[PDB]
Amino acid sequence: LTDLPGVGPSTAEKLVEAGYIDFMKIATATVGELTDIEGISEKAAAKMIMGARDLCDLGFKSGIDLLKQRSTVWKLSTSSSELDSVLGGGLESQSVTEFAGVFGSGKTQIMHQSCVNLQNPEFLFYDEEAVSKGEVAQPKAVYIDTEGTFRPERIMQMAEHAGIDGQTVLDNTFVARAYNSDMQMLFAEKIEDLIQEGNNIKLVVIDSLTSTFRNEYTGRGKLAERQQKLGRHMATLNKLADLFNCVVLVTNQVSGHAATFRFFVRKGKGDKRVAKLYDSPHLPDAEAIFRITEKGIQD
Ligand SMILES: Nc1ncnc2c1ncn2[C@@H]1O[C@H](COP(=O)(O)OP(=O)(O)O)[C@@H](O)[C@H]1O
Ligand SMILES: [K+]
Ligand SMILES: [Mg+2]
Ligand SMILES: [Mg+2]
């Protein structure tokens, strides 16, 4: 931290204590967040912010540097060939992907499968030139369970069928049971702490994203307040995805969100499932057919 312009030993101590230990967090911080630290003037705040941005080279970029930036994005396999393809490779880090659908369509299944695949190193697709092995080593997932449907037995089962130790997935997956939107949101904000503690969080799951908000703000005469809270939550999720080069997945029960990728999943004939990608910044709307078996997501 003392590398930052104006930052001396005492200021560094105040920053680390306030949770600002990383440069990108300071570079992307507002003078407000830092002046709130007290002891941190708006003067020092502005200088260290400018210096962090510069140290992180956050200016204008063009040409080949645009490709290099896009290359820091790694993708997580869904275990479904059709789905991975419709995704343009797999689930993207640095973005929030939403899986919406009626009850029983398979949203929770995809969340579980994703926690398992994170542990199969060959399921993380990346350009070693832009993403080092160290960056994706010992990856851990965070599962914010809003419904109480997290099933450790299901994790074990999927893991085993994929040839991976079930307990190893459990050992590297943090589950947080949230009973309301307040807990749901705090948990997500506290993910930054798991990382500061040495945990390489590479996958964040929110299952589900909207249940709590809907039960708390049913009155469609306050839907604005709800939308406001949900908006702040989503913003926290997108920033988390970006700053920590992390894959973020959310589910939504249906009978629009700030998610960069949005799917509609419906149950097909028996085993079959159809995921329709209807929203993304660079992919065409397309459907992927797959199935859910005792092995998890397959085909
Ligand atoms: N162990 C299993 N073996 C085969 N299919 C399973 C297994 N566990 C769950 N499923 C399938 O997952 C479906 C439920 O998926 P789920 O993700 O919970 O739906 P939702 O979108 O409401 O969260 C079941 O109804 C069942 O067909
Ligand atoms: K300094
Ligand atoms: Mg992003
Ligand atoms: Mg579910």
Domains identified in the chain and CATH numbers = 1-62 (1.10.150.20), 63-299 (3.40.50.300)
**Which of 143, 255, 244 lies closest to 188, judged by CA?**
143
Distance between CA atoms of 251 and 107, rounded to whole angstroms? 6
CA of residue 241 to ligand 2 center, whole Å: 29
According to DSSP, the residues that pair with 144 across neighbouring strands are: 176, 206
Question: Solving technique for this entry?
Answer: X-ray
Resolution in A: 2.1
Using CA positions, which residue lies closest to atom 14 of ligand 1? 104
Please provide residue 96's backbone torsions phi and psi, each rounded to the nearest 5 degrees. Answer: -105, 130
Using CA positions, which residue lies closest to atom 25 of ligand 1? 104
Structure tokens at 148: 């109480």
Structure tokens at 155: 């994790």
- Which atom in ligand 1 lies closest to the alpha carbon of residue 101? 21
CA of residue 294 to ligand 2 center, whole Å: 56
Ligand-binding annotation for 8, yes or no, is no
Distance between CA atoms of 287 and 83, rounded to whole angstroms? 8
For the chain, what's the residue count?
299
- Which atom in ligand 1 lies closest to the alpha carbon of residue 111? 17
Please answer whether residues 117 and 80 qualify as being in contact, where contact means their C-beta atoms are separated by less than 8 angstroms: no
Mutate to test the pocket of ligand 1, among 290, 292, 297 (most ligand atoms within 8 A of CB): 292
Please answer whether residues 178 and 146 qualify as being in contact, where contact means their C-beta atoms are separated by less than 8 angstroms: yes
**HEC per residue, 52-106:** HHHHCCCCCCCCHHHHHHHCCCCEECCCCHHHHHHCCCCEEECEEEEEEECCCCC
Ligand number, closest to the Cα atom of 2: 2
Distance between CA atoms of 279 and 86, rounded to whole angstroms? 11
Distance between CA atoms of 124 and 247, rounded to whole angstroms? 11
Establish whether residue 107 lines the binding site of ligand 1, counting it when its CB lies within 6 angstroms of any ligand atom.
yes
Please answer whether residues 74 and 137 qualify as being in contact, where contact means their C-beta atoms are separated by less than 8 angstroms: no
Please provide residue 175's backbone torsions phi and psi, each rounded to the nearest 5 degrees. Answer: -115, 135
Q: How far is CA 243 from the centre of its chain?
A: 10
Q: Between 152-161 and 107-117, two packed helices, what is the crossing angle to 10 degrees?
A: 60
Q: Give, rounded to a whole angstrom, the gap between the first and last alpha carbons of the chain.
A: 48
According to DSSP, the residues that pair with 299 across neighbouring strands are: none
Please answer whether residues 235 and 258 qualify as being in contact, where contact means their C-beta atoms are separated by less than 8 angstroms: yes
